[PDB]
Design a binder for these strands. Structure first.
Ligand SMILES: [Mg+2]
Ligand SMILES: [Mg+2]
Ligand SMILES: [Mg+2]
Ligand SMILES: [Mg+2]
Ligand SMILES: [Mg+2]
Ligand SMILES: [Mg+2]
Ligand SMILES: [Mg+2]
Ligand SMILES: [Mg+2]
Ligand SMILES: [Mg+2]
Ligand SMILES: [Mg+2]
Ligand SMILES: [Mg+2]
Ligand SMILES: [Mg+2]
Ligand SMILES: [Mg+2]
Ligand SMILES: [Mg+2]
Ligand SMILES: [Mg+2]
Ligand SMILES: [Mg+2]
Ligand SMILES: [Mg+2]
Ligand SMILES: [Mg+2]
Ligand SMILES: [Mg+2]
Ligand SMILES: [Mg+2]
Ligand SMILES: [Mg+2]
Ligand SMILES: [Mg+2]
Ligand SMILES: [Mg+2]
Ligand SMILES: [Mg+2]
Ligand SMILES: [Mg+2]
Ligand SMILES: [Mg+2]
Ligand SMILES: [Mg+2]
Ligand SMILES: [Mg+2]
Ligand SMILES: [Mg+2]
Ligand SMILES: [Mg+2]
Ligand SMILES: [Mg+2]
Ligand SMILES: [Mg+2]
Ligand SMILES: [Mg+2]
Ligand SMILES: [Mg+2]
Ligand SMILES: [Mg+2]
Ligand SMILES: [Mg+2]
Ligand SMILES: [Mg+2]
Ligand SMILES: [Mg+2]
Ligand SMILES: [Mg+2]
Ligand SMILES: [Mg+2]
Ligand SMILES: [Mg+2]
Ligand SMILES: [Mg+2]
Ligand SMILES: [Mg+2]
Ligand SMILES: [Mg+2]
Ligand SMILES: [Mg+2]
Ligand SMILES: [Mg+2]
Ligand SMILES: [Mg+2]
Ligand SMILES: [Mg+2]
Ligand SMILES: [Mg+2]
Ligand SMILES: [Mg+2]
Ligand SMILES: [Mg+2]
Ligand SMILES: [Mg+2]
Ligand SMILES: [Mg+2]
Ligand SMILES: [Mg+2]
Ligand SMILES: [Mg+2]
Ligand SMILES: [Mg+2]
Ligand SMILES: [Mg+2]
Ligand SMILES: [Mg+2]
Ligand SMILES: [Mg+2]
Ligand SMILES: [Mg+2]
Ligand SMILES: [Mg+2]
Ligand SMILES: [Mg+2]
Ligand SMILES: [Mg+2]
Ligand SMILES: [Mg+2]
Lengths: 141, 155, 70, 50, 59, 80
RNA sequence: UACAGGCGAGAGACCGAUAGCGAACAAGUACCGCGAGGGAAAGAUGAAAAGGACUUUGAAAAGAGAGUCAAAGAGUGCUUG
RNA sequence: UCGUUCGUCUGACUUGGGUAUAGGGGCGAAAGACUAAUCGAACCAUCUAGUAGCUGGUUCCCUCCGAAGUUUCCCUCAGGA
RNA sequence: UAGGAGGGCGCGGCGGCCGAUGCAAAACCCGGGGCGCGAGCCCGGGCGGAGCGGCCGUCGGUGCAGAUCUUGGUGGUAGUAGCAAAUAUUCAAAUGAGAACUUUGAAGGCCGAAGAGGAGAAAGGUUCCAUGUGAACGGCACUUGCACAUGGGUAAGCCGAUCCUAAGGGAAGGGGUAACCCCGGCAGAUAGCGCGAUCACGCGCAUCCCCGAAAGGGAAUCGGGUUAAGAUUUCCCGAGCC
RNA sequence: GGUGAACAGCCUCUGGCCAAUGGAACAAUGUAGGCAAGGGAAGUCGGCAAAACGGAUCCGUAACUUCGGGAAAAGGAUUG
RNA sequence: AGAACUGGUACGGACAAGGGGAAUCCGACUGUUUAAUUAAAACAAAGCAUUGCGAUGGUCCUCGCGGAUGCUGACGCAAU
RNA sequence: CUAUCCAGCGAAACCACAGCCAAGGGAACGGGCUUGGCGGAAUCAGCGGGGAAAGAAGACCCUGUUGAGCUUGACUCUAGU
RNA sequence: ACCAAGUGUUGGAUUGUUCACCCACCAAUAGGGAACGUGAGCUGGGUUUAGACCGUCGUGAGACAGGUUAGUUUUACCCU
RNA sequence: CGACUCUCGGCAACGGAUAUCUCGGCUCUCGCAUCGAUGAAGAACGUAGCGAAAUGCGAUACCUGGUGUGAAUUGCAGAA
């Protein structure tokens, strides 16, 4: 196609003799405001007791929630924290507002109790292969 | 030889002129419209600071296409301005020549100010540029006359 | 100060190339002051204008290549 | 050409002399209208056509 | 390797423009312009050469 | 092609200076001047261009001899 | 008796610089075309250059004072504009 | 015209200079191609201010009067009597 | 409306009449005052610095908003499109008012030898070389330049033209033609006569002129130096050749 | 000069240049160049464009044939 | 030419450098062509055939005189 | 590499005036008219719905008592034989 | 048949085709308008110049709402 | 208030219309008849203390000589 490929060919019929607001145009993408609802809470890490760390009832390698070498672009988590299933709006370090649901949670998928087995800790920077720097040090010597 | 506007007080005001200056008329107009009614010392600071690409001359009348800057928010909120260096460097020369005129007359060069500044079109100069399909078009400059009068401010 | 007239007239005197003429940058004044082939030649004997040595193109690698082909 | 006939050499000699600014004392001469040499010729612009 | 130029204005490589490379007492290669090859004289009857006559350009 | 590619091969001179008229109109291959008609005995002149006639009629040159003829008519060709 | 050529004269209910010859002027010129051929634009300071000495800012062009002039704001493409 | 990709490359081959053919003529391994950016008839000047029932324009005010698209004929129907 | 007529307004001359004008004419500008329904006119003020108006008769290249009207100027578009091929520049120093662009040096690169090297033919015609630079030009810039200004420079017995012919071209006599002009073998006491002899004469005359190649044929030159710019073989030095 | 069959391409020496207006940023759409998981022309009028094959040595080489070819057929192996 | 060893089975390591096959239509091939939108199946070609002509001649040019084929002559010129 | 911004330089096509819509009527598809919807300075860079956008006195068709090339059993002639 | 236009209505063979007609999936493979929506959005297959070939026609130049092949797709930076 | 836009006046620019001119044109009329082989018209090249054009002239070269007038040329210098 002469004059470029990546575009919309027809931006509307002759009549109305205007560009409809619903035709796809080129402009800002991202950094939009979005509410994304129904994210489940898996674990609360409250600093200062046994429930903080990334030790489940099955795995017992005494490790904290932060991966090896800190969270990329964010650093090391020391304070309290939540762990939500699925993704989160915005990049790392972004402030987010956690709001109670407006709906009435009654479905099974809302009522499952969540019991973990293993909290991956291998560094998210590259292909992490060990869970703890201590175990990497024992593996290398 | 007489300027468009006569001074508020002729004996206590210096005046300087230039004709057929080879600089852009539009750019120099946009310079002058920022320099009107400024103190002389602050005008030298400002304009040399413009040529130093650190403060911007707002573009208001001949502005369509001029990109935006943050450097000109204080005086044109939508921030549309440029740093016309040749225009500024030509206007500096007349500000200095009128400072010299006022010095010779005996005025307070510390208390002088821009009482009247006017840029105006001149006789265009002709050049030719060659286009597709064997056509030519004129390629002409817009030289300007720059005309300014410093007066001593009064209480 | 321009020494184009002395890069030329020095290639012509040394019988070399403009890229091989070398005018000692410390005393450009006298080089400029000498405006003739005669006065270029006295500068040549006085050591202010020299032929840079020809850039090296060693065939040591060609010799060793053929010696590894025999 | 470096091999030019004598006719062309003789007639290119004259167009050398034909190309000079007017003497300055022409301008001060009384009841004069000469403002410049309005018949100058430049070698890249006007070819002599011969 | 010190390329060469014609010593004349005959810029085309015709038969009359035979060139021989020589190295001069100046350490510099140049052209010399040679004579063209001459047949020499021949006997009409048999077409064979005439002996004792050098094969020279006629003039 | 025709045009720009083909204007580069204007290299040889069809016309050179005539000796009778000094115009660059001497067609060499044909050996005739294309303005004065040289080497014809008579000058090439045509009534379909009075503009071309006036450019080279009598009076556009020195008239080294005819300028004096009126003066010699006056006093009727006298020599002492 | 004829006479848009030439030489020399005289007149005009004509044209007044986009007019009148193409040409008031270095006009059949500058310029274009290989060539036949095409072919313009361009007039006015002032009475007299008396064409702006000099001082000062500027690298310089110029500016600002000054001076010449009846006027230079008539200041070398300069009558009015 | 530029880029890449292409055709041929000892041949009916590629090319410089000299020279011949000039307009209803040339030349054409034939496309109405080429003949100086012009070719199903070059370009320049002249006859020439070609002709046109056709298109476009057609310059100041007020006052007064103020229509026709119909008949007849015409190679006549966009026209004229 | 198309159209027709009447009466007037206005521009420029001519024959007359009445005037104005250096105490300011013509023109042009004005938020100035008016007259006429209107074409238009009268007055005021400013610039202007030498001519001008009114009335009667009469004459005309006589009235513009259009014609993709003609010439000249000016806008909006617009400080917008744009300045993008050929790998690439970087650092000190010098000059300079001013340096990304000048010059020197250093470093990195490209052309890569069917080159972005060294020389020529045609073509150009002074662009060559030096010194200087206000402007203009070098689509940014400049101290710089192939720009502007003033000077200088091209040396031949040997390198070419010159000489000879090619395709071909012009031509004397003649043939054609109204004449310019067209035909060159058509054979004409042919253009030219030649050579030996002048202490003169004898013999011959045959396919009978000129032009046409700086790539065909061809009397003769090599080496080393030298200039701001000429020369390799043009000048100088040596040695030769026709 | 090297590689190489090679006046191919690629790199260097002599000679010549860094002349194509520069500063900042790396958004969309472009111009030029690439790479892509599984599939492999379903895309489209159409395998347009791109990818793939490509040198050399050894082996092998069909139909058809004007008995000259097809043929560098196809199909394999090796390469420092 | 052959061999032993060696490498993260990589080796024409960059560059350079055929995709192959089964068929149909058209033109035999090579070649030429609408410069600036058509490169082809179009034009040409050798091959085949036909026609005119024995010089006081055939085809043709020329306003005329005269001229081209023809420095020729049927194993040739000329027109298809 | 551009596009973007910046320094410097810096055009052209085009242009009655201009630029928000719906429906109606209308030379039968309006930016202007009528009835409504609305409507808040000034700029930045894109884009290709519209401006029945620009380019061009439509080549398709027709009209012309306009041509031109070509053909032949058109009409009137002509070199040549 | 009713209230019902919110939502959806596909991948492919052949043809330039709209249309058509098959294979398959599907819940379904409904119809339509928007200057027969949409070329300064693309493509240029068809058609619609100039090349060329066949057939029928015409004595011939040429014609074909017959078939085939090759055939340049320009501009936004203005207003909205 | 302010920027932008539109607009009015004053002043300044760009531009060169108008007004007044005119060593020029055009038109009419009249008088005369005088180019060239004793080399014309045309062309080229030269020529000045400082000149390129135009005007002039020709190696005696912006002139030589006679006659007439009678104290200049002129932009600068100079011999006079
Ligand atoms: Mg395309
Ligand atoms: Mg990661
Ligand atoms: Mg061109
Ligand atoms: Mg050879
Ligand atoms: Mg040629
Ligand atoms: Mg020729
Ligand atoms: Mg008149
Ligand atoms: Mg005139
Ligand atoms: Mg005056
Ligand atoms: Mg006066
Ligand atoms: Mg004036
Ligand atoms: Mg190409
Ligand atoms: Mg040839
Ligand atoms: Mg040839
Ligand atoms: Mg042509
Ligand atoms: Mg008429
Ligand atoms: Mg006409
Ligand atoms: Mg009509
Ligand atoms: Mg009638
Ligand atoms: Mg009239
Ligand atoms: Mg008018
Ligand atoms: Mg008008
Ligand atoms: Mg009108
Ligand atoms: Mg821009
Ligand atoms: Mg570009
Ligand atoms: Mg070679
Ligand atoms: Mg070279
Ligand atoms: Mg130079
Ligand atoms: Mg520049
Ligand atoms: Mg000769
Ligand atoms: Mg020769
Ligand atoms: Mg020769
Ligand atoms: Mg000697
Ligand atoms: Mg090898
Ligand atoms: Mg190679
Ligand atoms: Mg893939
Ligand atoms: Mg497919
Ligand atoms: Mg398919
Ligand atoms: Mg499909
Ligand atoms: Mg298909
Ligand atoms: Mg392909
Ligand atoms: Mg095969
Ligand atoms: Mg073929
Ligand atoms: Mg073509
Ligand atoms: Mg093609
Ligand atoms: Mg015969
Ligand atoms: Mg800018
Ligand atoms: Mg509407
Ligand atoms: Mg409209
Ligand atoms: Mg309304
Ligand atoms: Mg932009
Ligand atoms: Mg915008
Ligand atoms: Mg766009
Ligand atoms: Mg649009
Ligand atoms: Mg029409
Ligand atoms: Mg009729
Ligand atoms: Mg006819
Ligand atoms: Mg008949
Ligand atoms: Mg559209
Ligand atoms: Mg097609
Ligand atoms: Mg066709
Ligand atoms: Mg038939
Ligand atoms: Mg058909
Ligand atoms: Mg048809």
């Amino acid at each position: 196609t002469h004059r470029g490929l990546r575009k919309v060919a027809c931006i509307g019929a002759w009549h109305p003799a205007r560009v409809s607001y619903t035709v796809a145009r080129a402009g800002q993408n991202g950094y939009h405001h979005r509410t994304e609802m129904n994210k489940k809470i898996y674990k609360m890490g409250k600093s200062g007791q046994e429930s903080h760390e990334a030790c489940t009832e099955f795995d017992r390698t005494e490790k904290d929630i932060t991966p090896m070498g800190g969270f990329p672009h964010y650093g090391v988590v020391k304070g309290d924290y939540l762990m939500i299933k699925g993704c989160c709006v915005g990049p790392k370090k972004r402030v987010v507002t956690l709001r109670q649901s407006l709906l009435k949670q009654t479905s099974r998928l809302a009522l499952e109790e969540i019991k973990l087995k293993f909290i991956d800790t291998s560094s998210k920077f590259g292909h992490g292969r060990f869970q703890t720097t201590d175990e990497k040090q024992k593996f290398y010597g | 030889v007489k300027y468009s506007t006569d001074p508020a007080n002729p004996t206590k005001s210096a005046k300087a002129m230039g004709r057929d200056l080879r600089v852009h008329f539009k750019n120099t107009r946009e310079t002058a419209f920022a320099l009107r009614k400024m103190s002389l010392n602050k005008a030298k600071r400002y304009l040399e600071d413009v040529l130093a690409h650190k403060q911007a001359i707002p573009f208001r009348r001949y502005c369509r296409g001029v990109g935006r800057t943050a450097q000109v928010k204080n005086r044109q909120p939508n921030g549309q301005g440029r740093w016309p260096a040749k225009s500024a460097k030509f206007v500096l020369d007349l500000l200095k020549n009128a400072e010299s005129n006022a010095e010779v007359k005996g005025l307070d060069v510390d208390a002088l100010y821009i009482s009247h500044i006017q840029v105006n079109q001149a006789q265009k100069q002709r050049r030719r540029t060659y286009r597709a399909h064997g056509r030519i078009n004129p390629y002409m400059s817009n030289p300007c006359h720059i005309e300014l009068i410093l007066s001593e401010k009064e209480e | 100060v321009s020494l184009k007239l002395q890069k030329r007239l020095a290639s012509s005197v040394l019988k070399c190339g403009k890229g091989k003429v070398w005018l000692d940058p410390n005393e450009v004044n006298e080089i400029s002051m000498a405006n003739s082939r005669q006065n270029i030649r006295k500068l040549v004997k006085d050591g202010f204008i020299i032929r840079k040595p020809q850039k090296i193109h060693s065939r040591s690698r060609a010799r060793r290549a053929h010696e590894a082909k025999q | 050409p470096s091999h030019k006939t004598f006719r062309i050499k003789q007639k290119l000699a004259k167009k050398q002399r034909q190309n000079r600014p007017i003497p300055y004392w022409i301008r001060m001469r009384t009841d004069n209208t000469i403002r410049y040499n309005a018949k100058r010729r430049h070698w890249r612009r006007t070819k002599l056509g011969f | 390797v010190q390329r060469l130029t014609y010593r004349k204005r005959h810029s085309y490589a015709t038969k009359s423009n035979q060139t021989r490379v020589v190295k001069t007492p100046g350490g510099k290669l140049v052209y010399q312009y040679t004579k063209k090859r001459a047949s020499g004289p021949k006997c009409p009857v048999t077409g064979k050469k005439i002996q004792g006559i050098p094969h020279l350009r006629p003039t | 092609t025709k045009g720009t590619g083909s204007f580069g091969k204007r290299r040889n001179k069809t016309h050179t200076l005539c000796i009778r008229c000094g115009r660059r109109s001497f067609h060499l291959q044909k050996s005739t001047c294309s303005s004065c008609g040289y080497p014809a005995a008579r000058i090439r002149k045509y009534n379909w261009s009075v503009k071309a006639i006036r450019r080279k009629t009598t009076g556009t040159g020195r008239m080294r001899y005819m300028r004096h003829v009126p003066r010699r008519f006056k006093s009727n060709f006298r020599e002492g």
